[PDB]
Amino acid sequence: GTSVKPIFSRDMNEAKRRVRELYRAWYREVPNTVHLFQLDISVKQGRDKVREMFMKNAHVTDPRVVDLLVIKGKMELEETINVWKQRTHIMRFFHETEAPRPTDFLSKFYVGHDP
């Protein structure tokens, strides 16, 4: 039993429905975000970034964790829609000023001690 209480959803199906609703809202919002914030990206890039952000935690199997993730996504969408966010906040999702970090063993061995 494990005697746990929910936040919103009882099982993973309701959680998936909430995830789909949040994804629909973000997908609808992306073009307006590109227009209002005067972004130099395309709408396709924004929608790809939204999809990548959703896929970053596609491995979650706890409905409570999914519920909290959806709540946080709604918070971020509310920040974006009301323009509380600025252009810098929107563009932090893309990491434009960070040099790529190599992932193979040899490059890591060459640069430093970090594993």
Partner 1 sequence: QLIAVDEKLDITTLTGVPEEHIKTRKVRIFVPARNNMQSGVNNTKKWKMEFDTRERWENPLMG
Partner 2 sequence: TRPTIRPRNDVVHKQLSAFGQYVAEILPKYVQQVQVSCFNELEIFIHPDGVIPVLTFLRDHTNAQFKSLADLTAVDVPTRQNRFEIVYNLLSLRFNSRIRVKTYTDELTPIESSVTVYKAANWYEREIWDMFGVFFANHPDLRRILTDYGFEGHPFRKDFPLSGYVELRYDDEVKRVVAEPVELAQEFRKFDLNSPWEAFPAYRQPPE
Partner 3 sequence: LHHALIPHGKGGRSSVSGIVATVFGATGFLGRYVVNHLGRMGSQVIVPYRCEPYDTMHLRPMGDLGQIIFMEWNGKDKDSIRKVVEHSNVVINLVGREWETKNFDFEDVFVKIPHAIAQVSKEAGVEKLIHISHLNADIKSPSRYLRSKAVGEKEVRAAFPEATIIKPSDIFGREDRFLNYFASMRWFGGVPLISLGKETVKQPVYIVDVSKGIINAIKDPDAKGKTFAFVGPNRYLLFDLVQYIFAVAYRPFLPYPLPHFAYRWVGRLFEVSPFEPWTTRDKVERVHMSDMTLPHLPGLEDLGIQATPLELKAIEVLRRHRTYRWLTSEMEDVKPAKTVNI
Binding site for partner 2 (CB under 8 A): 4-5, 7, 62, 64-65, 68, 71, 75-76, 78-79, 84-89, 91-92, 96-98
Which residue of 39, 43, 68, 81 would you call a contact of partner 1, by CB under 8 A? 68
Helix (H) or strand (E) holding 76: helix 63-81
Query: Using the rule CB under 8 A, which residue among 5, 40, 55, 105 binds partner 3?
Result: 40
Measured from the CB atom, is 62 or 79 closer to partner 1?
62
47 vs 85, beta carbon nearer partner 2: 85
For residue 17, count other CB atoms closer than 10 A to its CB.
12
The answer to whether the beta carbons of residues 40 and 94 sit under 8 Å apart is: no
Region near partner 1 per CB under 8 A, out of 25-33, 44-52, 55-63, 89-97? 55-63
Burial 79-110 (b: 16+ CB within 10 A, else e): ebeeeebeeeebeeeeeeeeeeeeeeeeeeee
Q: Using an 8 Å Cβ cutoff, are 47 and 27 in contact? A: yes
Instruction: Write down the residue that tokens 């970053």 correspond to.
Output: 56
Minimum gap (Å) between residue 9 Cβ and partner 1: 8
Residue numbers of the site for partner 3 (CB under 8 A)? 31, 34-36, 38-44, 97, 99, 111-112, 114
